[PDB]
Amino acid sequence: DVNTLTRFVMEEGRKARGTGELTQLLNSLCTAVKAISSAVRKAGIAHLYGIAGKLDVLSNDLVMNMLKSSFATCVLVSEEDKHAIIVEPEKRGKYVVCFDPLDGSSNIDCLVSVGTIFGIYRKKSTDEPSEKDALQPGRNLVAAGYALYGSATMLVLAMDCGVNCFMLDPAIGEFILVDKDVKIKKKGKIYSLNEGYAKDFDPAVTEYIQRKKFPPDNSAPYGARYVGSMVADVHRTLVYGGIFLYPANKKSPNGKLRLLYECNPMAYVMEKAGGMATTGKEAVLDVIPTDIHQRAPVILGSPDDVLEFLKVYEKHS
Amino acid sequence: DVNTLTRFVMEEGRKARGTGELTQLLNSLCTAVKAISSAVRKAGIAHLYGIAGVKKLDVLSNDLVMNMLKSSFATCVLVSEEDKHAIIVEPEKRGKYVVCFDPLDGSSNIDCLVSVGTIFGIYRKKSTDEPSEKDALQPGRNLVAAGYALYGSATMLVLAMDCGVNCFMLDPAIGEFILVDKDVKIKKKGKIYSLNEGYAKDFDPAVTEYIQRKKFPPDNSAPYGARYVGSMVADVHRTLVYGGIFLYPANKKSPNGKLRLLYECNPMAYVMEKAGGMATTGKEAVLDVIPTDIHQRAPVILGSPDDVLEFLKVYEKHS
Amino acid sequence: DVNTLTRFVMEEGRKARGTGELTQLLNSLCTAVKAISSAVRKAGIAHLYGIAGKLDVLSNDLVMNMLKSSFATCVLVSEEDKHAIIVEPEKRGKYVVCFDPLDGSSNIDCLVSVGTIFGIYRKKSTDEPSEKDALQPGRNLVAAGYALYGSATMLVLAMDCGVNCFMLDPAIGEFILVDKDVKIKKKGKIYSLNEGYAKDFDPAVTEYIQRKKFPPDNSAPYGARYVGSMVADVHRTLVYGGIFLYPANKKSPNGKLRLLYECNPMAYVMEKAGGMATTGKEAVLDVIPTDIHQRAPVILGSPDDVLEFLKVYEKHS
Amino acid sequence: DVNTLTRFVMEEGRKARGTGELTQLLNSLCTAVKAISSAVRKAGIAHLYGIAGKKLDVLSNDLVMNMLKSSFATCVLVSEEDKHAIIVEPEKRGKYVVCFDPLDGSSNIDCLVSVGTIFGIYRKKSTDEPSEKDALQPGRNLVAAGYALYGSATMLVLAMDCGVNCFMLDPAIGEFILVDKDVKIKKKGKIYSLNEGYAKDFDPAVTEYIQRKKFPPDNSAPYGARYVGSMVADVHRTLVYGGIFLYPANKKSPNGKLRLLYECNPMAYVMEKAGGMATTGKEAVLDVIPTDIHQRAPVILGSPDDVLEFLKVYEKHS
């Protein structure tokens, strides 16, 4: 019995009997993702090349304008803007949205998979909205998700009711629910990290990886996959199980990925799917941020694999 | 001045004044690639999920390539990753070319929306015998043309011939491949290495030492970055665009490698060499291996020439 | 400030605070119209012609299944089915839907514009659902509209708030609001009917057309257009003004077009746009039907032209 | 056995063993038709309406012009959109003259009526330097002609010496699929098509011919009437279902309404290759020798029996 993103979202709103802002917000995000997907696939490229005689900027403008027109937001934090964007009073609603409009776009020259990431928080006070209102821990997320522009376009959406996966049918521009209440494998067989920073790894990381290549219980060594695009590496981790690591290195002693609009939403998706997401010292979702662009080290995926890493990490004090 | 695949392919034929079969061959191939992309992007998936009340993708892709190539009247022997024996084209549809292809490489992991691709290489039939499986048992040196289509964030067709390597982007709005990169050449030296390091305990010692040099450079220069998508077309195109090295080498458990020579290694090796790169098995150029079985495997190290030459020095130092 | 069908529909529902079923119904119909459009434009025809080794039936199946899966319907009347379709109990909602899934498809061989027509009623009694629940006069319509699959695809939606026109952007599969609260011209310059049947015309019809071709005063004769597809002829009348006629004659005393899923929805659109729609004897929206497939004569369009028509019709009565 | 426009056009050239210019021209034209169809269907309209914060017939003209020029197969271009003929620059000059209407019917695209593209191709006949004179050839000299209809689906109809063939565009994969080979019009149809709002201006022959279609003297069934208002749509219906299409002269248009070079001549060429007829009343459309690239002409066309029945009434009226 077919179900679409629009129908799904409205039905969650009907059950909850909320004010409707979250529903309008997600519909706005839905439209922007379809417009980003069409541009990522290079629709209209022939006009650029003279048939009749930017991409990360356009994605940011799409998300920004669609979110403002939802009447559901008051503060917007993007990977693309230095300071938080404050919505003008006439378009202001109560939700705070942090997003990376096109993560991995550094390498789109080689047609690597890219994606969009978002996290939605509720503003708690009646004070005037400000950049501080986006300094909330991940635990406060109302909803989070990502769109992956891979071989097909897929939207993964996490709320309290669980994680659901929608495939974009480009023939009719509709998102079709194809995976309900997704749960990650208890243990995977793939680890994912840039091993080129091996000289700089913390000893816990170096040892954890060595166990993956030379298992102490005499099982099969893990395979390694590292696309270099965060959305792709995490989505594969969700689908197949396993582990993804972006630990601290010398260029990034607090890690490289951004807490507000990369780490937290992915951790929210992981935890809602029965996986885990840790910095090494605490859950990603428990870090209290002090800067909207602050970084975080991240280890996430199947819970047996993350717990195995935490045991190596704790053994190294 | 805008240029399309259809126009480009036709202009190459006019310059050469050939029989036209190769031009029809590429036209058929182009149509098949556009149909694979539309299905890889899941156009029509809503019908599978009951919007109005079914072949797996790699089966559909093989059916598209096989049917378009036969209908071109330009081929006589077809070798696919999907069939144990060669397909011999029936007489009324026969032309003079032998085509080896992998219709949807990487589809084992398409469940996670990883980049996938189509790879092809084209040879001319060499003997006066009846066409047979023997006719595809040619070395890569004999390739007339080869290339790949990558279904990544966008769809791109990379086509290599004697004139060099040219890259075409599919405009999905109008279904045209637009020429966007003419006469592409790989960087002389890169900063990325690509291989599955999870199988490190099985590596040949030469591979183990080379990987150590990329992570721990002896001259105190920058260590390389690593990428491994796991889809061959995706990793090779990244190597073509950014430079660096891709390895699927021999080890003691797999003395002839894992990848297939006729429809993976050779076409990728031809594109590399026409773009100024290198492709070796360790012992010889990939394009010089003479196959004995249409599905035989080969180890492959390819990419920027400086990175590959430095690899061969470690491999030789391990006499 | 950009506006989509999804956003429009949700905002009208928030203002009204209904139970949400009509919003889910309109969302389902939107998905059906996009799927019909993709099939009408022949996406996938290369597979029918053997690249890898009806249309109105498919349209009826898309509408039926999208409407049934909406949980908002209990009786469905389609031009394609002999009997009313009763929705199964677990999927039953409160709305009755009458529709023609692919109007004009008799002539789709020549790529003429075709269309979808629908009208939405609220079930009035608590009796078990039956064909009777669709036997309501057009005055009881909650909403109505049509989709035109012409050179572009457009959805025209009429409610109490008025008539709004949405253009389908096929690049992203979104309906974009392009014409808000549309109103027809007081008087037009085009008449539309099949003149090949002049030998069978009622005499009032013959004189009315003669005044349009040989005006008794010193004005310009009207132009004539007749596409043969009701949706296209009615949309042009809506946009340019004028008059559309499928009148009664002596061989067809009730006209040829069907009342429940052609005349009533189109008449409802006309009246919300400030136009008029008559059988000759009464307003189309006032006819009380006794059979779900009964025919009705319909003259509709600009009010001055319809009133001039009724003036000739009374002279011959 | 599946067949595409690209495959079709190349096989026709291989049979003929020409210089290749005509094949490159039709390949360009194909691309332009796919791009126009994409714009006619309003792909990207959400960006115009502010989703991120040329007129359709001008864009259509720039697509055909640019695609044709870059083909290296043309030397003179006549468009409905340009007052004077376009002379291709020398580095890109080929031997063909092309007459086209980039977006026929766009006056009424406001209501999403079917629109279309019409083209006609001649070989340049004289040896002088290219000029507007080179497009003043009679329709008889056409090498190829056709039209694209942007209707409920997009279809390209192409007529050559080998006949008339119809290709449906599959928008999923941007390919023209051959669906109707060697098309022939019915000997006699049952539909007539014209704007009857000009009845007060009709010459007596048109008035009598029409009167016969509504009140047949043989007490047989009256014809049905259809009039879309877009020439490509009305002519395509006439080709597919049979019948007759008329746009005769009126007081607003004493030399007719439609243009001879890029509307009448191509449609007449298609009619004649499908076994139909096309006349002005005085002569076959394809026999008129034009004197101006934008000159108008009256046209009666369609099933051969229906046109001859019209010519018989036309003769009866001196």
Ligand SMILES: N#Cc1cnc(NC(=O)NS(=O)(=O)c2cccc(OC(F)F)c2)cn1
């Ligand atoms: N927050 C929140 C919230 C609260 N109430 C809602 N109620 C409905 O949507 N109700 S309704 O479907 O009966 C309806 C009635 C009138 C018009 C209408 O127009 C639409 F179909 F165009 C839909 C929706 N959201």
Ligand SMILES: N#Cc1cnc(NC(=O)NS(=O)(=O)c2cccc(OC(F)F)c2)cn1
């Ligand atoms: N091998 C090979 C080969 C050799 N010669 C070729 N010659 C042409 O294509 N010539 S042509 O373009 O002048 C041409 C002439 C007649 C009809 C025609 O129909 C087409 F437009 F549809 C095209 C083509 N391929």
Ligand SMILES: N#Cc1cnc(NC(=O)NS(=O)(=O)c2cccc(OC(F)F)c2)cn1
């Ligand atoms: N009839 C009717 C009717 C009445 N109230 C409605 N209220 C909302 O949609 N409220 S909400 O946006 O706060 C919301 C809260 C919780 C979950 C949620 O789902 C998410 F997917 F969007 C949306 C909707 N329909």
Ligand SMILES: N#Cc1cnc(NC(=O)NS(=O)(=O)c2cccc(OC(F)F)c2)cn1
């Ligand atoms: N007029 C005309 C005319 C005359 N000769 C023609 N000859 C061919 O097309 N020959 S060929 O197909 O063997 C061929 C040979 C070399 C390269 C090639 O590259 C293409 F496949 F990329 C194709 C074509 N048109």
